[PDB]
Amino acid sequence: NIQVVVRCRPFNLAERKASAHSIVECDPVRKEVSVRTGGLADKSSRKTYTFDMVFGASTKQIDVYRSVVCPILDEVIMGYNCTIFAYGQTGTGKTFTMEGERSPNEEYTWEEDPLAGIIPRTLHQIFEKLTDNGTEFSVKVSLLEIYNEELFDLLNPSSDVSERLQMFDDPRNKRGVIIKGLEEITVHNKDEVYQILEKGAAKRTTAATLMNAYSSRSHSVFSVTIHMKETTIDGEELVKIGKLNLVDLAGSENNINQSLLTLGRVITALVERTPHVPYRESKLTRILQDSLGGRTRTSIIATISPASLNLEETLSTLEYAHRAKNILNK
Numbered sequence: 001n002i003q004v005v006v007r008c009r010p011f012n013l014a015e016r017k018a019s020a021h022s023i024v025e026c027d028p029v030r031k032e033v034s035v036r037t038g039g040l041a042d043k044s045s046r047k048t049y050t051f052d053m054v055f056g057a058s059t060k061q062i063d064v065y066r067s068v069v070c071p072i073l074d075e076v077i078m079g080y081n082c083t084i085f086a087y088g089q090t091g092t093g094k095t096f097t098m099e100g101e102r103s104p105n106e107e108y109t110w111e112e113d114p115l116a117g118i119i120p121r122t123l124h125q126i127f128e129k130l131t132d133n134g135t136e137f138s139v140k141v142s143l144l145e146i147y148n149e150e151l152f153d154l155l156n157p158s159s160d161v162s163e164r165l166q167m168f169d170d171p172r173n174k175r176g177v178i179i180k181g182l183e184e185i186t187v188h189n190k191d192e193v194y195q196i197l198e199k200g201a202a203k204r205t206t207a208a209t210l211m212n213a214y215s216s217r218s219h220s221v222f223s224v225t226i227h228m229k230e231t232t233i234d235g236e237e238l239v240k241i242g243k244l245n246l247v248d249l250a251g252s253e254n255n256i257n258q259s260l261l262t263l264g265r266v267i268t269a270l271v272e273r274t275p276h277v278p279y280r281e282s283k284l285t286r287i288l289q290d291s292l293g294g295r296t297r298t299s300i301i302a303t304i305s306p307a308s309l310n311l312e313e314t315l316s317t318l319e320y321a322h323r324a325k326n327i328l329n330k
């Protein structure tokens with residue numbers, strides 16, 4: 001059920017100039033990645049994995065979108081729920097993919113930057129779709145961020161960041177959680193998107209100065225909520241509701257990440273079909289359980305680097321992703 005893709009990044013002008021070599025071969029047609037574990041572009045011992053989709057370095061933000069995002073949007077617009085994880089070592093592109101960057105010198109705008117990753121393109125699309133058709137709606141987005149099993153609202157501009165939120169189970173629906181004081185911004189028009197991000201980009205930063213190796217050590221749950229009151233060429237008023245989750249996991253690389261640690265356990269639990277799954281042992285898991293064996297449709301984007309210094313983490317990441325395939329939610 002759970003679909004996993006492997007996105008492979010390309011050489012930075014560090015491994016470019018240093019005339020270095022890759023050890024990763026990402027083939028989109030056979031849908032697999034083959035790692036060189038021993039040595040020699042001549043005689044070598046390799047390691048090969050297959051997943052649901054593979055994108056080489058030659059891939060562009062736009063290619064990742066129509067291929068993995070579009071469906072999950074259409075679904076999410078039927079009232080469904082969807083989740084997207086990004087997973088992997090630090091420095092491999094988990095963020096680039098999820099957020100993207102900005103094309104330099106000011107070439108383009110935020111609605112045409114070939115560099116903009118998921119979260120951006122997505123918002124510009126939710127509007128660019130329901131707006132078009134005789135559809136009535138409203139959307140909201142929030143950003144839960146985890147640092148040391150401490151919750152953080154990266155958008156709320158009324159209070160700083162030392163202020164950690166509080167988690168309680170929802171007595172309403174079992175397995176749910178209540179996030180005391182979480183902010184849910186309301187995006188009225190496609191022209192609000194950009195500042196909303198420019199905002200968190202700040203607040204993040206103060207967080208980066210507040211606690212150590214924040215970026216590498218945190219989990220950002222970016223959530224966009226669509227309230228739909230559709231109305232086809234009939235007169236019926238749909239009441240669809242969709243929640244699409246975009247998770248930028250912490251550095252897969254190995255103080256201690258209780259959540260990162262609870263996730264691996266959570267998975268293994270579901271794959272070995274172990275009667276008891278340790279959701280409740282970390283915030284992420286509780287906060288995000290329905291995705292791990294629940295009703296939500298989830299997909300993982302594992303990220304890797306060709307550098308031969310990263311062999312041990314690459315294999316580790318590709319083994320992780322490859323096993324996360326047998327989980328079956330929905």
Ligand SMILES: CC(=O)C1=NN(c2cc(C)ccc2F)C[C@@]1(CCCN1CCN(C(C)=O)CC1)c1ccccc1
Pocket residue numbers: 098099100101102109110111113115116117119120154194197198199200201204222
């Ligand atoms: C405000 C802004 O420009 C941008 N904000 N982004 C963004 C910000 C937050 C909270 C959450 C989710 C997001 F998606 C994405 C980014 C790019 C953000 C830049 N990132 C990576 C670059 N940074 C680094 C390397 O430290 C700062 C944060 C963007 C937006 C539209 C089009 C292209 C790129």
Ligand SMILES: Nc1ncnc2c1ncn2C1O[C@H](COP(=O)(O)OP(=O)(O)O)[C@@H](O)[C@H]1O
Pocket residue numbers: 008009010012057088089090091092093094095096097303
């Ligand atoms: N497919 C890619 N193309 C270009 N740069 C990439 C790609 N993937 C990752 N990068 C990058 O190399 C660096 C690592 O990216 P980042 O997205 O912050 O990784 P992470 O968040 O996993 O630690 C950034 O400069 C970004 O430009």
Ligand SMILES: [Mg+2]
Pocket residue numbers: 095215216
């Ligand atoms: Mg990052």
